[model samples]
Structures are given as C-alpha cells and as structure tokens.
Target: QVQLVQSGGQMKKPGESMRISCRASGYEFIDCTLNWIRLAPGKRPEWMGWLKPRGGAVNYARPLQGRVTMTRDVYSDTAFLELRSLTVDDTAVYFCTRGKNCDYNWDFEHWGRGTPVIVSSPSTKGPSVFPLAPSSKSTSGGTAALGCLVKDYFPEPVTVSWNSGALTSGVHTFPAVLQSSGLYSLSSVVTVPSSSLGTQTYICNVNHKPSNTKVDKKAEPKSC
Candidate 1:
C-alpha cells in the first residue's frame, strides 16, 4: 500500500505564512508524482497543483496561481507547499496524493491524509497590498530599464506581470523572484530602448490570487 501523509493542522492569522510537508512510504515514493489538491469546506476538490518529484517541475492550476508554491527535497523524499500571506478565506485542508501513473504524472490515483491550515482574522481588515514602483539603472547602452516590486501582500498568491507602453513584443522579462525580507515580497524587472522612454508607460500589474483585484502601478523609465 502506498502511504502519503501530510502535516498536522495549523492555526494562522491573516498575512502570516507557513509550509506543509508530505512524507511518503510503502512505495517507491521518489519515483511517483505527488499532487496537491484543495478541499475547501462544502466545495468539490479543486485542482490546485501537481509536483513532479523526479523532474523537479511544479505546475500550479490557474485557479491557484502561485499562491500555493510547491517544493521538494529528493534527499528526504518529500514534497512541500509554502502557503504565504494567509487569510481566513484560505483556511482549508490541503491533501497530497499519488498520481495514477507515476511515470505518466497521473491524477488522483491514491490520496493520503491532509493537514488543515486555518487562517483567522481578528481585526476587520482585508489584505494590505502595495504595488511598488520600478527601480531602474542605466547600462551605458541606449536602454531605459524599469522594475516592479510587489511587497509580500498578505493572503498571498499574487500574480506579478510587467508591462510597458502598448502590449508590444520585444520586452523580455525576468521571472518573478520571491524575497523574504521582514515579509514575503515578489519582484521583477523589464527593459526597453532608451528611445521608448517618455512616449511609453511602464506598468506593474498586481493581482490577488486566485487572481483578482487587478491593481496596476505606473513605473516611468528615466531617459538615458
């Protein structure tokens, strides 16, 4: 019998973050893929995300965005979920299970137990979010750089996308990076020719996860 066990129940307030782990035994744990699903009260199972233990690849369901980040440690043969910026709405039980075909990245073939994460809000306050302005630097080249930083907003699982001017191509973007400084925050950078400056507008679109409350910030680039 394949065994997958999740972390114990946790109690947290809005904005706090925590990580849950899953331990597997009774099977070739490392050889199979483990998936994490959401079991909200009175709701059906939601396809939150899945983890490929062998490839170290994580794919999050659009519904979950990146709010539920998955990580793994092959050394210990375990999978982990980091639930950041908690909220009462996020309080629920998360289950991890084995895929049908470990080689095929199967669906819920076998389900293990779950650990409940409870988010309690004491004060009547929603999540506090800030769409940080861009910080730029020159490169001696005729280039104007722009940046967007989203301070770790509570009730996390925020989507950070960068934009400048009309949604034209050629603007390459660096993957958003999560930083832990006092609180969980995410940041990213964008670049364009210095000539595109003044005429274009740099923007950072911050969305609350399950992806909503679209907030856009204007980040203007300096002339080179």
Candidate 2:
C-alpha cells in the first residue's frame, strides 16, 4: 500500500516547541522529496519546507526560513517537522507530501493525512481539505505502435484504458504497474495499420481510485 500516515494534531501554548512526524511506507524513501506543507486556519496551502529523506537536505519556503526545521530519521522511516517558537498564528494543519524537486515550491501527487494542530493547549478543532501525456511515433510509417505511457497518478490500484474513440480495433495494454511510491506507470499499446493513422483519434483515460478523480487526454497522431 502506498500510504503516508502523520502524527495527530497538536494543541500547544505560545512559545512552546511542537514536533510531528509522518511515517512513509510501501515505497522507497528515496523516490522523491517529502515536503512539509502548512494550511493555516482558513487558508490555502503554503509550502513550508521539504526534506530529502536520502541526503537530509531541506529547503524551506521563504516565509518559513527560520521558524521551523525539517528533518528525516531514516532509521525510523519518519519525516519530522519541528517548530521552534510557536504562536497562535502557527495554529494550522500540516501535511507531508512528495514532490519531484526542491529548487522551487512544488506540489506532489502523493499526500498524507492532515495533522490538525491548534493553539489552545486544550481545545479541539479544525479545517480540512485537500500532468503530462505520452508520445508515440511511426518510425517505419507502415505499422505504428500507438502508445500511451501513463505515469504519475496516485491512489493506485487505478483504472487506465484507451478509448480510440473510433478505432478500438487492435487495442492492447500491460497492466498498470505500481511503483514503490504507490503511484502508477502504465503503457498501453496498439498496432495501428498505416491506413488509419490520422483517421482515428486516440485517448488515454485514467481513473484515480483512492482520490476518485479522472483524467482523459488525447495522444498525438500515430503518424508523426
């Protein structure tokens, strides 16, 4: 199972230290960077910081440069977020997510549960919430491998299929393969006779199971 389980919310006093961790399992710790995301009360997500589980390199958002620290404990398979000087404004639910890079703020397809944190030290509360295509060409131009290589979809155990819309004649595909991170990468192949190259439209539709969202995009013509 590709899963990210975070610690419970924190209700802390001002100036106190707060720390929480997310346990990552069923995936490689090195697949991508784990980002610490913050969603302040009645606010959108602000990329707080991110931790590279393999090298322990963290890049904090400009706003969070010194307020918080991001760390990784490989031995425990957990990524931690520590707040140095807390404030009422620090009251927010945090999430640990995965991303491809740290050069700039990024959003990942894989995410964990929200850690609802309050500032009362006793009260309960909170809020809640929370790309590409393929290219196949006809090298020989006689019979082309019309392929749709789908990658980077989450909530796996997903359903991916091709709707040639008009030409479902020679459709075939390997099952979607689950990566260590639980995202899926799949390759759907069709042997298109040159006669039907530009005549028929090809579409790859993906249905993300865990998230219940669907995406359908058309691939390029098999001729070019």
Candidate 3:
C-alpha cells in the first residue's frame, strides 16, 4: 500500500506565493526519488521534472524553468513544491509521483492524489474538478472504482456524469460539504466491472450549473 498523500488544494491570485506538500508513506522518504507532474485545464499531463530526495539535485521542464522550486524534508517524509510568483496560466493540478533511483531516464511508480492550484481573482469562483486514478481499495468483488474531487466551487449544484453512462451500476456521490473558507467540496465515485477495464480510458464529467463550468477528466483503471 505505497501511498503519497498530498496536502489540500490551494487558491491564489496573480503575483502571489504558494506551496504544496506531498507526504510519502509505506516507503523510505529518501531511498526512492520523487517527481512532479501537472495537468492543466484542457491540457494533457506535463512532466515538471524530478528531484532526488537523498541529495538535492533537481531538474525542471523548459516552460517551468526557474518558475518553480522543489524541496523535501526527509524527516517529515514530505516533499514541497513552491512557486514564488503565480499567474493565471500557473493554475493546474499538481501531482507528486515516486520515481526510480536513476538519472535522466526516470519512470514513475506511485502517484499522489494531487493538489490543485487555482489562480484567479475574487470575481472568479468556478469549481475545480479532477480525477484520481481508479483504485480497487474502494470497491472489491471483481469491480473497480473511479473517483473525482470537486473542490473550492462556489454557488450550488454541480452535476457529475461518466463517459460510459451505461456501465455505471454502483455510483455514489457524496453531499457537498462547505469548507471553512466558504467554498464547497464534493466527492463522487463510480464502480464498474473488471471486464470493462481493458485498454479503455474512463472519463469523469463535472458541470457547475451557475458558473457554466464544465470539466472532463480522464483516468485509467488498474487491472482488478
């Protein structure tokens, strides 16, 4: 049960500062390396680069060169990603994954749930929705479960749908819980048979009626 539980999502304005943490469990903090990945709205996954926990060696994606920094506290088993200055374009769901102990050619093994960073002013209060990789832990008995987190949304009424509408026989959506910051948070999960988990991508669609915000997040299921 190797897991990387990350800190909560964040909301920041332009030119502001922000930092997110990823706490590693079920493994040594410094033995294996760690890497950061980001998935911006309407964009594919982007590799931000990898950091060596044992030492402090780091690398960054060309677009993110000098735009962000990575640091880790080995004693706390947590790694941090910091952005000195933020812009609207910096808004994205950031993730930390475990990487092999090697050089330039790095591959990820485990992934953190993700810490979304939404950069906007007070006027914009659209919800942030993203999918977590499907896991069998939530659902057993020859079935896999797909989950999504809709956070920091304002105004009420967020609707969720699956790409394979017919395949969802056991879908559970939790009631929206208001955060202390006055924003809303939600969780939706759907269960599908293992027979349908081959080479197909599952998509979670989220719609916020008031804001007319629509997000389609795609995730792949592990073989159950």
lDDT of 3 by residue, 1-224 (tens): 67999999999998898999989888777777788888895678988877778887788788888778988887988888887688766889999987543343356767889999988754547778767666544423476767789899875668887774644667787999878786878988887765566655678888887777888887665546
What tens-digit string does per-residue lDDT give for candidate 1 at 151-181?
6454455665666245545444344343443
Model 3 weakest lDDT span, ten residues long: 99-108
Listed in order, each prediction's TM-score against the native is 0.52, 0.50, 0.52
Model 1 has an lDDT value of 0.68
Give the lDDT of residue 130 in candidate 3: 68
Q: Which pairs of residues have clashing backbones in candidate 3?
A: none
lDDT of each residue in 186-206, candidate 2, tens digit only: 666667665554576666665
Residue range with the least summed lDDT across 10 consecutive positions in model 1: 124-133
* C-alpha-based local distance difference test score of model 3: 0.78
Off by over 4 Å in 1: 103-107, 124-224
